Amino acid sequence: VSDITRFLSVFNEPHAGVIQAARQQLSDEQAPLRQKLLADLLHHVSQNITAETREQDPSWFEGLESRFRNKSGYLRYSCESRIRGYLREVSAYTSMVDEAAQEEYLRVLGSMCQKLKSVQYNGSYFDRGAEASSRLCTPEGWFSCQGPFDLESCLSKHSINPYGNRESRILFSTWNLDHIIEKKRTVVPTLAEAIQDGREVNWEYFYSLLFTAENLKLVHIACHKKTTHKLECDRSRIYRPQTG
Amino acid sequence: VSDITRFLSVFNEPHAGVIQAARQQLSDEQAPLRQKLLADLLHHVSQNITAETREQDPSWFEGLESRFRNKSGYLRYSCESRIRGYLREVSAYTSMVDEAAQEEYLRVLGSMCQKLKSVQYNGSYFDRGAEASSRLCTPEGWFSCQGPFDLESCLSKHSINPYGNRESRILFSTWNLDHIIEKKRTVVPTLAEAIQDGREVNWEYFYSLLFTAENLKLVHIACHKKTTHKLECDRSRIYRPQTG
Ligand SMILES: [Mg+2]
Ligand SMILES: [Mg+2]
Ligand SMILES: [Pb+2]
Ligand SMILES: [Pb+2]
Ligand SMILES: [Zn+2]
Ligand SMILES: [Zn+2]
């Protein structure tokens, strides 16, 4: 059954008449399953990961505004958006906070924003060619599913390289940056409750929870459990230590 | 280059030691691309489309409530949800309607709901084993991307069988029932404006537009243009003909 090696051998490296071959078998209608595999294979091969600029691989950029000249640049922007989205969701909550603590909330929410700008909304997480302690991918653009929140790794071994294909760039939209300790369900509200407590809040902790890879797992959609994460915040890290 | 035929030949029909083979090459770490193709192949093969009950293929049902015993049944429910979702979105608009026409809107919105219940929210669209003039798939469960709204067919030839795999069932979540004439952008508001007109509204027309395959294209995420569909409603079908 060692057969396969010879198969993965030819179907991996493109630049051949294989691309112009698989396409023919596709045009020439076939069974649903065979058509699938064939469509997938063409996808797998019709790729150009190495290209970085719109000039050398404009296909990738189809549909993206013009400001986007570089791939890393777009993905960086994309990541910044999800995270900026989390910051918005956090402000929207100021209303469900006690009017008495509503001021401090905004004060705290302001600090988190400065720090976010200070780090450029962590857009660094999606762009290869960034410090290795910042990116979530290999310098080639390969991301690995980190498995569901309640597991150590991805049992299916999901991966994806949004950099070498237009469809690939779009599928990455389905990959989620999932909060281990749910942000809406638990972190934000705990944040509110902590600010009303009276003790000085260690907002940096909530920052970690809300916008950092410390509490974010990058998962493929099949590893995004939409069920409740039965986790809670760390009682001991919520408030700033009183220096006795 | 006719090679491939021999390849798609072995990689399509499972039930062999091939499954227990590809898995080994996966465990035995490899290059990112080879690992990809390999992970995908395992996916492609680890399938059981023919199974219909939770009893004969419980793997598929992982994560679904217990009430769901049958596959078609779940997918039917799933479809009904998207469509019921469109009905909600339509009610939520009653507030942005003139108070004077706000009553009729609810009257009309009521009629559409009766008809929807009368047809079971068209959940029929997703379940194989339904009248051939109702399903969007083959009796085996195969759906074909109908390409973007502004095109006749899917150039990439996207297909998917949510019935033979858990991950497959979840990916179908990314496949969208896209309104050709945008519902929020154009149909709903036209509906509101038409009800304020004074002439008798042919609400059945808007029904078609809002909940039927007459105005819904089933597209893979890569064929869901989120750009504006520069279309408008048919001026001549909005109002009921005055019998002269
Ligand atoms: Mg989540
Ligand atoms: Mg749409
Ligand atoms: Pb701000
Ligand atoms: Pb109703
Ligand atoms: Zn995974
Ligand atoms: Zn398509």
UniProtKB/Swiss-Prot annotation, chains A, B:
Organism of this sequence: Mus musculus (Mouse)
Notes on how activity is controlled: Inhibited by DFFA (DFF45).
Assembly and binders: Heterodimer of DFFA and DFFB. Interacts with H1-1.
Protein name: DNA fragmentation factor subunit beta
Full-sequence range covered: 85 to 328 of 344
Keyword Nucleus part of the UniProt annotation: yes
Localization in the cell: Cytoplasm; Nucleus
GO process terms (BP): apoptotic chromosome condensation; apoptotic DNA fragmentation; negative regulation of apoptotic DNA fragmentation
EC id: 3.-.-.-
Record-level Gene Ontology MF annotations: disordered domain specific binding; DNA binding; DNA endonuclease activity; enzyme binding; identical protein binding; nuclease activity
Keyword Transmembrane helix annotated: no
Keywords for the protein's UniProt record, in alphabetical order: Apoptosis, Cytoplasm, Hydrolase, Nuclease, Nucleus
Organism lineage string: Eukaryota, Metazoa, Chordata, Craniata, Vertebrata
Main location: cytoplasm
GO cellular-component term (any): nucleolus
Entry function: Nuclease that induces DNA fragmentation and chromatin condensation during apoptosis. Degrades naked DNA and induces apoptotic morphology.
